[PDB]
């Protein structure tokens, strides 16, 4: 299966350990700037679409406005205290709403919020 000019498009990954160090240093840089804050953002629990994977859950893009209000977190403050917000996802079932609301209350219990100035 080499009917094209494959030799001019061949990528060798000799920088695999070099890029890993670069990625690890970039993660350290984020911790340097956001010193007490985590380097990530809290993300919700979602169910995989297909019937092949619907028995398993994973992480979504951001929290729905309805489940953010049920937790007791204002919309405009959520991206500021380290919570991802997704305005495209709908709940459609109490099961998804309850799981992510409980996730938010667990996040609020562990939070240390400093005065503004």
């Amino acid at each position: 299966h080499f009917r094209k000019h494959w030799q001019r498009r061949v990528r060798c990954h000799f920088d695999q350990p070099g890029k890993k160090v670069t990625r690890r240093l970039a993660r350290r840089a984020k911790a340097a700037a956001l010193a007490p804050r985590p380097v990530d953002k809290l993300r919700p629990i979602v169910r995989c679409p297909t019937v092949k994977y619907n028995r398993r859950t994973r992480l979504g893009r951001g929290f729905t406005l309805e489940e953010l209000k049920a937790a007791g977190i204002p919309r405009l403050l959520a991206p500021t205290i380290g919570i991802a917000v997704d305005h495209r996802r709908k709940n459609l079932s109490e099961e998804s709403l309850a799981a992510n609301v409980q996730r938010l209350k667990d996040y609020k219990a562990r939070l240390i919020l400093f005065p503004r100035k």
Binding site: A32, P36, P38, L59, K108
Partner: protein, 167 residues
């Protein structure tokens, strides 16, 4: 290649570029993290000492053994087991251990001043002219045209008078 050969042939000095970096790799300043951060440890190692969490996502591999920075209902409504239409918006009404975490909890709970806003000199005069003419009748003040030209409600005038201490 020809440029590189030319430079090696030339008498001009080689401009040795110092290893400057766009983003710093260590915290700096006079805060708790900067004074406790160890440059020779890793991100997770430093956060584990602090007693904090570094990654809120899912663990993508095996960690070190000591790592601790990587994580009646009549109406039958599931939210009833989660409670303790307007909420606070600029703050959260939030309710053995490492030194850094304990120090951080003290800074977050330290009482601070508020810098209460005052009213302008002319705003006091407008309020004072109201209380001079109508006394304590907020309804009469709202209906006045010369002394209340912006047609503000009685509730708003009452609130401003309380802030001024004019009842």
């Amino acid at each position: 290649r020809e440029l590189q050969k030319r430079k090696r042939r030339s008498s001009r000095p080689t401009i040795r570029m110092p290893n400057r970096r766009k983003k710093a790799l260590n915290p700096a300043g006079n805060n708790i993290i900067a004074k406790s951060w160890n440059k020779k440890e890793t991100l997770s190692q430093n956060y584990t000492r602090f007693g904090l969490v570094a990654k809120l996502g899912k663990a993508t591999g095996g960690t070190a053994p000591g790592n601790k920075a990587l994580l009646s209902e009549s109406d039958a409504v599931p939210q009833q087991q989660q409670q303790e239409n307007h909420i606070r918006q600029h703050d959260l009404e939030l309710e053995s251990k490492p030194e850094v975490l304990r120090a951080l909890e003290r800074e977050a709970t330290r009482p601070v001043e508020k810098t209460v806003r005052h009213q302008s000199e002319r705003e006091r005069e407008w309020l004072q002219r109201l209380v001079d003419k109508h006394g304590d009748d907020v309804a009469a003040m709202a209906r006045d045209r010369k002394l209340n030209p912006y047609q503000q409600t009685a509730s708003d005038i009452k609130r401003r008078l309380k802030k001024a201490g004019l009842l």
